[PDB]
Write an enzyme that holds these catalytic residues in place. Structure first.
Site, PDB file in Angstrom:
ATOM      1  N   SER A  56      43.021  17.905 -49.751  1.00 29.02           N
ATOM      2  CA  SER A  56      44.389  18.270 -49.385  1.00 29.02           C
ATOM      3  C   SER A  56      44.602  18.421 -47.877  1.00 29.02           C
ATOM      4  CB  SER A  56      44.787  19.571 -50.087  1.00 29.02           C
ATOM      5  OG  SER A  56      44.839  19.398 -51.493  1.00 29.02           O
ATOM      6  N   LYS A  60      47.325  16.011 -46.157  1.00 31.16           N
ATOM      7  CA  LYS A  60      48.732  16.381 -46.186  1.00 31.16           C
ATOM      8  C   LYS A  60      49.312  16.542 -44.786  1.00 31.16           C
ATOM      9  CE  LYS A  60      48.492  18.786 -50.611  1.00 31.16           C
ATOM     10  NZ  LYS A  60      48.690  20.023 -51.331  1.00 31.16           N
ATOM     11  N   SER A  95      49.869  24.470 -49.765  1.00 23.10           N
ATOM     12  CA  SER A  95      49.111  23.386 -50.385  1.00 23.10           C
ATOM     13  C   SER A  95      49.719  22.965 -51.719  1.00 23.10           C
ATOM     14  CB  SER A  95      47.651  23.799 -50.585  1.00 23.10           C
ATOM     15  OG  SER A  95      46.848  22.674 -50.890  1.00 23.10           O
ATOM     16  N   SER A 120      40.389  21.557 -50.987  1.00 25.60           N
ATOM     17  CA  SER A 120      39.305  21.744 -51.946  1.00 25.60           C
ATOM     18  C   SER A 120      39.420  20.774 -53.115  1.00 25.60           C
ATOM     19  CB  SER A 120      39.293  23.181 -52.463  1.00 25.60           C
ATOM     20  OG  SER A 120      39.029  24.096 -51.413  1.00 25.60           O
TER      21      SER A 120
HETATM   22  C1  LIG Z   1      43.872  19.918 -52.279  1.00 25.00           C
HETATM   23  O1  LIG Z   1      42.711  19.898 -51.912  1.00 25.00           O
HETATM   24  C2  LIG Z   1      44.270  20.641 -53.547  1.00 25.00           C
HETATM   25  N1  LIG Z   1      43.163  20.732 -54.430  1.00 25.00           N
HETATM   26  C3  LIG Z   1      43.379  20.816 -55.830  1.00 25.00           C
HETATM   27  O2  LIG Z   1      44.510  20.802 -56.275  1.00 25.00           O
HETATM   28  C4  LIG Z   1      42.200  20.932 -56.771  1.00 25.00           C
HETATM   29  N2  LIG Z   1      41.697  22.112 -57.001  1.00 25.00           N
HETATM   30  O3  LIG Z   1      42.248  23.198 -56.379  1.00 25.00           O
HETATM   31  C5  LIG Z   1      42.183  24.360 -57.173  1.00 25.00           C
HETATM   32  C6  LIG Z   1      42.952  25.457 -56.472  1.00 25.00           C
HETATM   33  C7  LIG Z   1      42.811  24.128 -58.534  1.00 25.00           C
HETATM   34  C8  LIG Z   1      40.743  24.803 -57.328  1.00 25.00           C
HETATM   35  O4  LIG Z   1      40.465  25.798 -58.049  1.00 25.00           O
HETATM   36  O5  LIG Z   1      39.820  24.186 -56.733  1.00 25.00           O
HETATM   37  C9  LIG Z   1      41.624  19.707 -57.443  1.00 25.00           C
HETATM   38  C10 LIG Z   1      40.265  19.547 -57.905  1.00 25.00           C
HETATM   39  S1  LIG Z   1      40.139  18.156 -58.517  1.00 25.00           S
HETATM   40  C11 LIG Z   1      41.521  17.476 -58.398  1.00 25.00           C
HETATM   41  N3  LIG Z   1      41.557  16.163 -58.927  1.00 25.00           N
HETATM   42  N4  LIG Z   1      42.412  18.388 -57.760  1.00 25.00           N
HETATM   43  C12 LIG Z   1      44.713  22.052 -53.221  1.00 25.00           C
HETATM   44  C13 LIG Z   1      46.050  22.331 -53.875  1.00 25.00           C
HETATM   45  N5  LIG Z   1      44.828  22.209 -51.815  1.00 25.00           N
HETATM   46  S2  LIG Z   1      43.969  23.372 -51.036  1.00 25.00           S
HETATM   47  O6  LIG Z   1      43.965  23.137 -49.546  1.00 25.00           O
HETATM   48  O7  LIG Z   1      44.661  24.710 -51.116  1.00 25.00           O
HETATM   49  O8  LIG Z   1      42.562  23.453 -51.580  1.00 25.00           O
END
Ligand SMILES: *C(=O)[C@@H](NC(=O)/C(=N\OC(C)(C)C(=O)O)c1csc(N)n1)[C@H](C)NS(=O)(=O)O
Length: 261
Positions: free
Chosen positions: A43, A46, A103, A210
């Protein structure tokens, strides 16, 4: 010991692959560690999509105020802001803010859909000289972060230079530049990452990221209290899919490289 060895020891004990690229704008010096290797941005990508939208507003003074319809069908895995405006509207200025500060993945998908696909975000990166950045998928599938997968990847060095240009350099016009910094500065998701490794007095604007494979990222612009700004990229990934996300490692890496500033 030197800065290099400490990072190697931190990596070897963490059981993963650590990428670091710091730029001291004072003398344009650099602290590198696997900074020419590809990591999954997650992320953190972005910042590009929002910057692409900001660049459009330089030629259209009515773009950021343009409403956007938020359907219930547009919601994905994580979107704390967009879930509130279902059956309503959110401007691109709000979509941009939510995407970076909270995010929100739906907001991110709205920015891409507006630009015309992930390929348009990549083409924008090319216009800034970034030959390394690439975006292949929308959210959340862009966070799969599979090892050896080149999709949705860039190197720590490429992002640091681009992020430097975006927030301090010649990428955007001043108004658009100040808006991106304002957004990054108001991030609510990076208290435990790079900021936790720096003095609490320092001003910091960052974007975390993440994903799977314990992938944990954070790109940040730093303003010291009595020195020129710094630009720090900290990528980290692990070999096993369902690994835990280690923000504490990014906090450790920041403290090691910023040791002296
Ligand atoms: C961007 O990295 C984005 N990541 C995700 O949405 C994923 N997981 O995040 C959560 C919070 C659900 C977790 O518990 O790890 C994810 C894992 S796999 C996939 N196909 N998506 C988040 C929203 N952005 S961040 O910068 O806040 O991490």
């Amino acid at each position: 010991n030197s800065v290099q060895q400490q990072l190697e020891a931190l990596e070897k004990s963490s059981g993963g692959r650590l990428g670091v690229a710091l730029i001291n704008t004072a003398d344009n010096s650099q602290i590198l560690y696997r900074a020419d290797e590809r990591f999954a941005m997650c992320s953190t990508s972005k910042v590009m999509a929002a910057a692409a939208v900001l660049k459009q507003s330089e030629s259209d003074k009515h773009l950021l105020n343009q409403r956007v319809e938020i359907k219930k069908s547009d919601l994905v895995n994580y979107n704390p802001i967009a879930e509130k405006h279902v059956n309503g509207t959110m401007t691109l200025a709000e979509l941009g803010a939510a995407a970076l500060q909270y995010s929100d993945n739906t907001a991110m998908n709205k920015l891409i859909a507006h630009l015309g696909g992930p390929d348009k975000v990549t083409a924008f990166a090319r216009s800034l000289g970034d030959e390394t950045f690439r975006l292949d998928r929308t959210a959340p599938t862009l966070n799969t972060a599979i090892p050896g997968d080149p999709r949705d990847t860039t190197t720590p060095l490429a992002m640091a230079q681009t992020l430097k240009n975006l927030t301090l350099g010649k990428a955007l016009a001043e108004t658009q530049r100040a808006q991106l910094v304002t957004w990054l500065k108001g991030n609510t998701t990076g208290s435990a990452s790079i900021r936790a490794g720096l003095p609490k007095s320092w001003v910091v604007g960052d974007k975390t990221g993440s994903g799977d494979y314990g992938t944990t990222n954070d790109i940040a612009v730093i303003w010291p209290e009595n020195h020129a700004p710094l630009v720090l990229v900290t990528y980290f990934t692990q070999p096993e899919q369902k690994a835990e996300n280690r923000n504490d490692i990014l906090a450790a890496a920041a403290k090691i490289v910023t040791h002296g500033f």
